[PDB]
Design a protein around this ligand. Structure first.
Ligand SMILES: O=C(O)CC[C@@H](O)C(=O)O
Ligand SMILES: O=C(O)CC[C@@H](O)C(=O)O
Ligand SMILES: [Fe+2]
Ligand SMILES: [Fe+2]
Lengths: 349, 349
């Protein structure tokens, strides 16, 4: 039966890997949250494996196990970073829930009836370690998540490690894919259980895991109709409106047909998250703090000639463009919805 | 009660006018078809009346009773035209119903599952008079409607009358409104009872009545949501999908809120039909053949600066543009609908 076969290939992250030296299972199923949709595993390969180069070339996710991309950072931890990252400001988000929904502050002007579930708070690294230390011993329920792009104000040793990254490998990837420039490197340090809701980015991304384990659930661009992203002008643009913990099938019927690709990444693994691919990221339950550094690259330039059929991500690009134009033409983003409905009601639906 | 007051101002074409010389009522209520919506009267004024100049300036319909625009043509009739219009080809549409829905043949390629309710048949004027004579005596049910733009192949006397038109008046109108060039002059000769379904044009129009009487029902551009025009790429683009004789309130709920402006025009009257205004035109029942000549003018150029709020017709222009672009981008007009739905479902509705 194809039914049974389907219930099998939907193995998710599969059997937990064993850490060398018989140090036991990296993690166990109970550390993963439970969702209503099925998921197939993302291929875990060697960077020397042609299949991996094949997946990246075809804009498909793949976990590279031996790139040594951020090898020098694998020694990183709270103590080390505090004594070497510098005294610059670090964006720290606090929240009353395990979900850290991303919001664009420049767009909070278009929607005043919008209040974020998490607030940003700038501070020095030692302060973050402090606020965190407080909560851990105070037994608080508050959750924190540090997300700061690595700037030119970081300490000497941190700059040293940075230089030790495997630029030879990634620079060749950048070149072979025709991608644009490296736009930034985001350092992420979250508490166990933390979750970054499903969303997509308009950048190519090499997601390098350093400390702790993270479960990454991706969805191809062609599942746009099942994930219902917020309006382009809304502050939560590119994020999914669907609450994965309590799906509202009445407002989002097609979320019942969603099928993901998941995997659990650990120290040393690099996950290629293709541009426009949706991704849900959560730090395993009771797994301790997690550390990650991403590498965002501008996508390759759109080809002078346009071949048909268009790819899923090209249609997503068109929809985004329409929403943006209409917002400018109407002189007000709030009127985008009414005009769109007027356009389709009784005409295209 | 505002209810009663509303039921009063909704007088439609009002009391039938009396023809000079005590020749009786021009027409009577029983010659008008019955519809499910209410209608207020269009102002019937003198071209010297400032109020008329006011309405035209504000892009609002008005019937001018004394322009003498097509004074020389008032003598026109089948016999005269046959002996003077020439031997060029005249587009003649035949149909099994009283409704002559307009269709764009260049767009019949995008929709193959579309078959017009009326067919075009080129012929010489004398042939049209023939086919018509046949039906009238044969007691046939077939209906004909001649619609041919006046070209440079018309007879001498017809050209004479043409020259006698009141160009002094209309040329000043064209100049005062900043309108573009005169694009064409359509000659319409239909059988009693004929109907041109509700639709709008992207041209300014001076509709000059010559023979017989016509009931014209207009709807302002802001009633777009109540009239459900076909998709822009469909051959019936700009026409209403709503069957005025048997409205489908299930597919077109807002047609229940539609409110029109009507009037009955006769020999000598000129009806200004502003650009984008919907219009329904029917030749009175048992009123004999009708003759009309319109004057289509390119609208004025869009102002360099755009003031807000936009006017209803500007939003209609934006919607049309979106449909067109999307059709080009997707490489196929048939995919416009699916993409639009994907865009709004669970996001803007
Ligand atoms: O690790 C996370 O919490 C999410 C990061 C992800 O959105 C990215 O683009 O790197
Ligand atoms: O007279 C008619 O049948 C309709 C003509 C009208 O659509 C016009 O644009 O002049
Ligand atoms: Fe992301
Ligand atoms: Fe028309």
């Amino acid at each position: 039966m194809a039914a049974t076969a389907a219930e099998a290939v939907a193995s998710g992250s599969g059997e937990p890997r064993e850490e060398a030296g018989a140090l036991g299972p990296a993690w166990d199923e109970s550390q993963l949250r439970s969702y209503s949709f099925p998921t197939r595993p993302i291929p875990r390969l060697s960077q020397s494996d042609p299949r991996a180069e094949e997946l990246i070339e075809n804009e498909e996710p793949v976990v590279l196990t031996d790139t040594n991309l951020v090898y020098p950072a694998l020694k990183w931890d709270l103590e080390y970073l505090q004594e070497n990252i510098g005294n610059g400001d670090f964006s720290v988000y606090s929240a009353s829930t395990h979900k850290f929904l991303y919001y664009d502050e420049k767009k909070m002007a278009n929607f005043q009836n919008f209040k974020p579930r998490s607030n940003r708070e700038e501070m020095k690294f030692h302060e973050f370690v402090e606020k965190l230390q407080d909560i851990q011993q105070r037994g608080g329920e508050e959750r924190l998540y540090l997300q700061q792009t690595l700037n030119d104000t970081v300490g000497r040793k941190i700059v040293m490690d940075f230089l030790g990254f495997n630029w030879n490998w990634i620079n060749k990837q950048q070149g072979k894919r025709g991608w644009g420039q490296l736009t930034s490197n985001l350092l992420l340090i979250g508490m166990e259980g933390n979750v970054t809701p499903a969303h997509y980015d308009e950048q190519q991304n090499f997601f390098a895991q350093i400390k702790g384990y993270k479960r990454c659930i991706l969805f191809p661009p062609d599942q746009f109709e099942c994930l219902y992203p917020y309006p382009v002008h809304h502050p939560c643009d590119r994020q999914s409106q669907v609450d994965f913990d309590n799906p509202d099938y009445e407002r989002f019927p097609n979320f019942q047909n969603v099928v993901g690709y998941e995997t659990v990444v650990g120290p040393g693994d690099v996950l290629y998250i293709p541009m426009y691919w949706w991704h849900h990221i959560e730090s395993l339950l009771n797994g301790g703090i997690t550390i990650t550094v991403n590498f965002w690259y501008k996508g390759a330039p759109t080809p002078k000639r346009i071949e048909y059929p268009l790819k899923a991500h090209q249609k997503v690009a068109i929809m985004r463009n329409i929403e943006k134009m209409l917002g400018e033409a109407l002189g007000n983003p709030q009127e985008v919805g009414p005009l769109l409905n007027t356009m389709i009601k009784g005409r295209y639906n």
